[PDB]
Scaffold this active site. Structure first.
Site, PDB file in Angstrom:
ATOM      1  CG  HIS A   1      77.522 110.037  45.309  1.00  0.00           C
ATOM      2  ND1 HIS A   1      76.622 110.932  44.481  1.00  0.00           N
ATOM      3  CD2 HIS A   1      77.666 108.836  43.459  1.00  0.00           C
ATOM      4  CE1 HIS A   1      76.672 111.253  43.567  1.00  0.00           C
ATOM      5  NE2 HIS A   1      76.879 110.231  42.795  1.00  0.00           N
TER       6      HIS A   1
ATOM      7  CE1 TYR B   1      74.213 105.968  50.418  1.00  0.00           C
ATOM      8  CE2 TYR B   1      76.049 105.872  52.136  1.00  0.00           C
ATOM      9  CZ  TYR B   1      75.088 106.453  51.618  1.00  0.00           C
ATOM     10  OH  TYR B   1      74.010 106.339  52.556  1.00  0.00           O
TER      11      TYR B   1
END
Lengths: 95, 95
Positions: B69, B66
């Site tokens: 990302h 995450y």
């Protein structure tokens, strides 16, 4: 449903076993406070904001009946010396 | 499961419509980031303490995915002028 987020830092004198018993007691408050539906807690692992120094999180799902409930007030009476700082947020989760 | 808690305060100039757009975009990130399983947010009603809003993200290893990302990086690139301060916590909720 309404939630309360508690963010805290313990004083340096407080030991690991003391913290575990602090959270275990707070979790068991669910069984004796009818307003309290759920409690989870957790210890921050990433320490992204260590200037602030907050280390632990409590998620309570439900507030005035809880606030003045003698079990809640009593928990605050027993453990107040444990925490160096404390933030409390009340909110309704949404998307 | 691993959670990320974000506590924030917006700048005084940020408008209500902007905040709404901020959170809807953040919530739609679950659609672009495979690691992101769920998101809720909420506004503190009690003002017990300057933080005003909370975001709960549900997923520690898949948190690195995450963080790097492009969609998460891009979200910060778009909106970081909005917030005056923020706290971030990663933890595993337990009892």
């Amino acid at each position: 449903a309404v939630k309360q987020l508690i963010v805290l830092k313990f004083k340096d004198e407080i030991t690991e076993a003391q913290k575990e018993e602090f959270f275990k007691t707070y979790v068991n408050l669910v069984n004796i406070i009818p307003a309290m539906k759920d409690v989870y807690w957790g210890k921050d692992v990433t320490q992204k904001n260590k200037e602030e120094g907050y280390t632990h999180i409590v998620e309570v799902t439900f507030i005035q009946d809880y606030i003045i409930h003698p079990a809640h007030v009593g928990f605050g009476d027993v453990y107040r010396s444990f925490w160096e700082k404390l933030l409390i947020f009340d909110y309704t989760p949404r998307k």
